Write a protein that holds these residues in place. Sequence first.
Motif, PDB file in Angstrom:
ATOM      1  N   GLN A 121      55.232 -26.637  11.585  1.00 14.10           N
ATOM      2  CA  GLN A 121      54.874 -26.991  12.762  1.00 14.10           C
ATOM      3  C   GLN A 121      55.583 -27.632  13.953  1.00 14.10           C
ATOM      4  O   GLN A 121      56.014 -27.455  15.102  1.00 14.10           O
ATOM      5  N   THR A 152      53.737 -31.538   9.522  1.00 12.64           N
ATOM      6  CA  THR A 152      52.943 -30.500   9.717  1.00 12.64           C
ATOM      7  C   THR A 152      53.544 -29.139   9.323  1.00 12.64           C
ATOM      8  O   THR A 152      54.414 -28.636   9.894  1.00 12.64           O
ATOM      9  N   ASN A 181      47.142 -18.605   8.426  1.00 20.59           N
ATOM     10  CA  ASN A 181      46.117 -19.206   9.366  1.00 20.59           C
ATOM     11  C   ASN A 181      45.843 -20.748   9.433  1.00 20.59           C
ATOM     12  O   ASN A 181      45.269 -21.265  10.213  1.00 20.59           O
ATOM     13  N   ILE A 225      46.929 -24.638   9.709  1.00 20.06           N
ATOM     14  CA  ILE A 225      47.832 -25.724  10.144  1.00 20.06           C
ATOM     15  C   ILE A 225      47.475 -26.985   9.511  1.00 20.06           C
ATOM     16  O   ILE A 225      46.478 -27.342   9.575  1.00 20.06           O
ATOM     17  N   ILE A 226      48.484 -27.686   8.535  1.00 15.20           N
ATOM     18  CA  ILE A 226      48.018 -28.843   7.916  1.00 15.20           C
ATOM     19  C   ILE A 226      48.812 -30.020   8.103  1.00 15.20           C
ATOM     20  O   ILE A 226      50.168 -29.466   8.184  1.00 15.20           O
ATOM     21  N   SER A 227      48.321 -31.108   8.497  1.00 13.85           N
ATOM     22  CA  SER A 227      49.136 -32.148   8.460  1.00 13.85           C
ATOM     23  C   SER A 227      49.184 -32.804   6.991  1.00 13.85           C
ATOM     24  O   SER A 227      48.238 -32.728   6.220  1.00 13.85           O
ATOM     25  N   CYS A 251      44.427 -27.774  16.709  1.00  9.59           N
ATOM     26  CA  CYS A 251      45.869 -28.154  16.862  1.00  9.59           C
ATOM     27  C   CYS A 251      46.085 -27.767  18.556  1.00  9.59           C
ATOM     28  O   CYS A 251      45.646 -26.766  18.935  1.00  9.59           O
ATOM     29  N   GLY A 298      45.203 -22.761  16.203  1.00  5.84           N
ATOM     30  CA  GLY A 298      44.069 -22.826  15.406  1.00  5.84           C
ATOM     31  C   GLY A 298      43.393 -24.161  14.916  1.00  5.84           C
ATOM     32  O   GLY A 298      43.135 -25.013  15.857  1.00  5.84           O
ATOM     33  N   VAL A 299      43.267 -24.501  13.596  1.00 12.79           N
ATOM     34  CA  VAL A 299      42.894 -25.755  13.202  1.00 12.79           C
ATOM     35  C   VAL A 299      43.858 -26.702  12.434  1.00 12.79           C
ATOM     36  O   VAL A 299      44.670 -26.051  11.664  1.00 12.79           O
ATOM     37  N   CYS A 300      43.882 -28.084  12.615  1.00  8.50           N
ATOM     38  CA  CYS A 300      44.719 -28.736  12.037  1.00  8.50           C
ATOM     39  C   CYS A 300      44.013 -29.410  11.163  1.00  8.50           C
ATOM     40  O   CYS A 300      42.819 -29.536  11.021  1.00  8.50           O
TER      41      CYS A 300
END
Lengths: 436, 442, 435
Positions: free
Chosen positions: A363, A387, A392, A394-396, B78, B86-88
Amino acid sequence: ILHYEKLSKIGLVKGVTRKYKIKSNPLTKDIVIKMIPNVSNMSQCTGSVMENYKTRLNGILTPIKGALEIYKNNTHDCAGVCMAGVAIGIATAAQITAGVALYEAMKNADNINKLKSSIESTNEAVVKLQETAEKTVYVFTALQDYINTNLVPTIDKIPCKQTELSLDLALSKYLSDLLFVFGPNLQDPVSNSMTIQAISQAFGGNYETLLRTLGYATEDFDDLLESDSITGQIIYVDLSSYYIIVRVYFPILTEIQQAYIQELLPVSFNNDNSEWISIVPNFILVRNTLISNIEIGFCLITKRSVICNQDYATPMTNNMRECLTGSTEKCPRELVVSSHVPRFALSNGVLFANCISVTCQCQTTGRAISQSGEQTLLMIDNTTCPTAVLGNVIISLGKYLGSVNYNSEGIAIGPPVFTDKVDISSQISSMNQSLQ
Amino acid sequence: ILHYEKLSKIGLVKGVTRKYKIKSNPLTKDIVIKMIPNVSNMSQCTGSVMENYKTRLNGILTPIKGALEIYKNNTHDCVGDVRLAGVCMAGVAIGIATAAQITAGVALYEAMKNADNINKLKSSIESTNEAVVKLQETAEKTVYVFTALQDYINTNLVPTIDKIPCKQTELSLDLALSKYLSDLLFVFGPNLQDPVSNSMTIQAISQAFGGNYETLLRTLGYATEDFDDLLESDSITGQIIYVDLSSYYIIVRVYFPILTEIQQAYIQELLPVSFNNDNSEWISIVPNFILVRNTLISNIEIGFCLITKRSVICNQDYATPMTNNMRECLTGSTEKCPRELVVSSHVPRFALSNGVLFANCISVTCQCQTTGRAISQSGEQTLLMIDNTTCPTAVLGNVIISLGKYLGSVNYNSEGIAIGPPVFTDKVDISSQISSMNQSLQ
Amino acid sequence: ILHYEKLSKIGLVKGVTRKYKIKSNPLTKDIVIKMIPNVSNMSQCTGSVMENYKTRLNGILTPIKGALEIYKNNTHDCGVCMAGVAIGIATAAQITAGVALYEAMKNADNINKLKSSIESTNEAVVKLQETAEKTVYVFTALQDYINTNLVPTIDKIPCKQTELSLDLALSKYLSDLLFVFGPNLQDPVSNSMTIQAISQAFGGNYETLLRTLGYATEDFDDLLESDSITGQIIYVDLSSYYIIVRVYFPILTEIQQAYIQELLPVSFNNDNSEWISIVPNFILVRNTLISNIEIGFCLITKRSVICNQDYATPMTNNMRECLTGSTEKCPRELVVSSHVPRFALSNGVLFANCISVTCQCQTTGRAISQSGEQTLLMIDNTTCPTAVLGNVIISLGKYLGSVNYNSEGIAIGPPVFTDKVDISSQISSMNQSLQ
């Protein structure tokens, strides 16, 4: 200890660690379960199904009493329980322990049976009797709620002959629910391995009422219940009033010292242009620095502990042991054929994923994260970029605690296997034919 | 790719061929289940059982919300048009998670956008006093409330509130709630370690509604003619997205997928038949069901799948590998197929495929009606093929059968095959055999 | 044929000897289950829920009729005579079931002749006369629930939307049905479906069916538990929504010269460590032939083993040698649990591992010592009559085998591991060793 670093390169990432607790130190409470409901208020046109029910219920209860008399006639005093093995013949260690417990409970069974007239006269679902000055006993009637709520109020509105057929059908349904537990399946009534859930089938499967009336003595009650750790034992059966007294055991969950559960999450990994998944037990018992399997299907898994009503430790092959403690070349692997196998997993905030079998990009730069054909999975952390995006999600990500050069070092890989039931026989046959 | 003639001669007669379908492209519908009933009309002398049930239900529902909050606190949108926006995921605050768990987490956040709107209805959800209720979510949207114990109360306790002593109504109630909790603990108790995932079947969810899933699915709607299928194969799954400890009601997103038949993918069933060899009866040990897709041969763990008349239906691609030797056996290398000596007298000895009859006439008496004479099997023929060329009407014990014509080799019954080695498939036999080969190797 | 003395040394203490009896000679009876209740008394608030239930039940029952019609259309008199060209795929069990179905059509015609009587029933059990001599009982699924709850409450409430409760009751009934007569059901032809499963169309109340049919055998409970009493669907009606089931009531015929022997496992010491031996708990001996049995499917009693089918399975030759005296082939497993049985009593004779449980028999007033070369210590009245272990004080009988039991040793078999992953690991290691 388990080497999780080399195990994660195989596709086994660390999961939760759980503390191992076993049932021990059980208290005793005595209750009365009356199998025949009181029908005094509905006796005016109860018909002849009461006698038929009584005969059928004798047909069930008589073998139970017969198997109990084998120990009843062989226990006496000579100080402690004094057994006679000549008239017993065949008995296991569990059976002998159950017989000793039975003779112990006979001392209070006599006092409970002294209130036989009170027990028979009960007409509520849960009835309190004063078994002595400083202790009381509870009486549970199998179908008394049904009679008091449905059948009794509708004794003059609905046709009584129809009430006669209803009552019958109810009795039948109760007998049908009983026979899975109290029928000829109950070959050994002298046992304390029978769960309160099964015993509650004598009360309609409603073990909550029994336990709540008895008392939630501990904060670990639900884990005890789901583990069926709350066990019971039949200690007296009456063929005249059709009731059984059951000594329910309420134990405490004792944390086993220097023991824990380790759970490993499987991740599909890439090898030789194909996807593979490694086969190791999902859960490992480590007790006093000794690694052994744990039949877990019977145990109950919580977020911080694994609760078992018996010590379910089962042996580990040396080869499996070596595989779990570093020698990954001994870790068997099975080719992947399911389009729905797991491909990524999050451990300690750091991601291990097979980015050649799944979309994989970063990201903070927008660029793709590429996986070569040499490496099995990718450690994604804030070092590579803070990140990641995997479809689908998105992960920190958080920091890694192991080696800084995780992704630049390769390991050896084990041999392929097939884990189908028929595959075991074929491999044995081929190996036998190869040996010959 | 399966060579049926050698399979039949070993004893694996042709069976039905079924297509392979999997759950796919799931639509969503949101509902709420109130796990506590409204006792307002009968609250005059309910007693203290309501409070005790309240505490017990709080104790059971607290871990579910605790596990949900791990994702709720760590899920956020995010910012900016760079990514899909979408979602973080506060991954370091999540700690331990699988792919399926994270996926469910994403679907949980997605559903939050609607769950906030449904939670605006909290007072309406509390006010529900019927076992099924429909509510307006918006001028273009609707939501359903299911009451865990409203039918029983409204049908028995309210009508019988005076004809019996009130204390008795107290007990009955207590017993009813305890029965609910006992049925519940199998699913919503401490067994539910991971409420976030959406792999839980609608049948399991309906335990919170007394096990009546047919009412959940009928009220939502029979969206397709395959309905019984997505129902039995455990393809209809739901997820808990919000747990409330004040009104004791959960919101469940029900998934209604569509069954995608997989192209170039069929399931084959093989019928085993006992065959004679070396003056004894044997049955070959091969998978009953085999999955052949893209000219690739693989097993299938069909125990969790549903085998209808025309298709094999699975809520997940349950394809599993198959040994190379099994592939060669099913391809024609018939000597690699294992066989088990049969000591049971209740093993089938004949089968019918395409109207041609395969039988072990050594084990079972065969005679032909048209010629009025026995049908003889010699000691070196494993099975006897009977068809109209042999004779148009044969019998096997008490059955008169009329047979069609064979499509393969005309001289089938005159050609023999090779036979494989014996095997034993008991659980202790595997351990016993492994020791023997290990000792032999040493 | 089983060498119990040598099996005691490896922990397999001889247990109860039981008699083997299998299902045979089934009688036949005819019942009709009407899977929709008659609501002529409560037609007032039947609303429309019944039309939806009709559609749902028709959809459920249509595949059953379709899978019966293959044999309906292909069997005729030419005894029973069948058309195998238009049937195509069929098993031996399916063919036998179709033959029995044809034999049952003779009574099915007379039963169908009373369709109006069947559809007019308004009770859970009603007696009907199909002939001048024979009678038939009809079971309606939810008539008891209707007549006891919804009928009285129809005038005790302003309907209060009885639909909601009738709809839910029928929905719960259908939810119960879908486990047995739902998509799962694929071969309604076969007769292997148990009366317990059939009763799900009646709410699982098989006891009412079996009592009304009038069982007249002393083996009734063993028949019911061992899944011996089965049923067969012989006809389906989509206009009145009732089905006819032929219930088979068999008798238990003891297999001559056949018995099943039980082995009780006891942990034993070897090389300062504790093992349990991996041998089947139950062993079937038939005409001096030893074979296994998947005894989980059958029912075990105090004196007999009751199976609805002959569940004999072959045993490895090495296991047969193990159970006939050569104990070195018997596999053993390490005990890493603290809850394995440690003693057992056989013929009033106690076998125990005194190393792992303290033994001090009261008659001698001293501890019982087991050496480092004895797997199990045998105690009887010859050494000292009454023995004490933990909290049990037990008096003992006399041994019938060798009086010099405790002085003789034996050979021991190799260790094994029984976990599925352990089996795969052992297979891989053995394959690598061969290479």
